[PDB]
Amino acid sequence: QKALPASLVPQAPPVLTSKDKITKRMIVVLAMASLETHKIKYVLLNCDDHQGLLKKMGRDISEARPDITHQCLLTLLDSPINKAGKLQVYIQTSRGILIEVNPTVRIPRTFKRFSGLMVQLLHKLSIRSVNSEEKLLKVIKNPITDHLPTKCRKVTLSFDAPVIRVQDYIEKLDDDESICVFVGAMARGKDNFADEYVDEKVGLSNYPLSASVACSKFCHGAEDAWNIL
Amino acid sequence: PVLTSKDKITKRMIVVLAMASLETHKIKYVLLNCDDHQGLLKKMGRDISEARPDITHQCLLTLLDSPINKAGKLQVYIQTSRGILIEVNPTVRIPRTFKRFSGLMVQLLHKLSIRSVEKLLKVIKNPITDHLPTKCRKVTLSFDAPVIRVQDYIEKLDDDESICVFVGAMARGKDNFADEYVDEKVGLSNYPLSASVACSKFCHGAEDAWNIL
């Protein structure tokens, strides 16, 4: 009944960046990421691969597992919404380092080369593309708020908080605003890592959720809510 | 109750990780990996591209950690590319690290069962069809297939039946690994999906459809 537009050809949606604050998007923050490097060559500290070294450092090795950060980044990056250009990932390392994750990046799925990337990132402060056109992974200055959109809703993943339906939540939120989620890649701890920044904390399921499972569940609702498919 | 292959009446969400690239090689037997063993596999003549058991772990972790598994409505089956079919007890808690997972699987492939004191992981005889529920709908994941809403698909499907999804953990290959058992192939997302994300998508839909929460 209607005439087709001037150009129907599908064009790649714009790659979202911290500079742009207007466009609606789904922000995810994997707070309390356990990413640390140490010279033996520099290697990302691991719970299993290194046990004596962290004991010498005096840090509890239970909270020394970067694979949880690895698994989340894989699911967040591989989610269809990221392919749709409606997602950017932020990482607050437990030491206080804030990292920019360009949506275009493609992290390795093997855990070893995952670590090799971040030892490079942590020391060089940035990562450049193979084609050398854009810095996929970049460290940025804290606090997170200045990089976040001007109008944005902030929430955390809290097991104790009331259980909600993600799809209904995103629908009732406004359109111009954006939704920002604080997820703890930590193994175990108090859910107060980002209490200062957030305004209200939500629970997703009654049962306990893994960080990746909680993130994957949340993004699917956004895709269902936003019809990303 | 913990769901088992013996029970067929109960509706459950069965997930089959077809074309799983798990293999043990001794110089002691160790799970072959794309990165750990490059030269050795080059001597074998097999491409290191299709030597990634890591993908299976990610699919297993997200599936096992999914809420529906916590609700006891999920069972995982794994068809190794070599032809070995593995039963996954829902109660298990597989290692989170990749290395500890490989040590587990080498034991399972050699000992044919894992018992910790019911076998947590049990190698069972092919074909898949015998072990699956008597009344059950079978589908594979196909990018070229029409895109279908998982929530609507399960809702329109019957209740006494059960649903099987065949997911290819293979790094690259034609989506015909399980054409013989399946009756139709459906598309989950409009975009290409990794094995892990599609499983995460599908169990999320079943949770919405069955109100598992």
Partner: peptide
């Protein structure tokens, strides 16, 4: 073009 579960190149 990388797709699905294809990994970044190994050198």
């Amino acid at each position: 073009r990388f797709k699905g579960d294809d990994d970044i190149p190994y050198k």
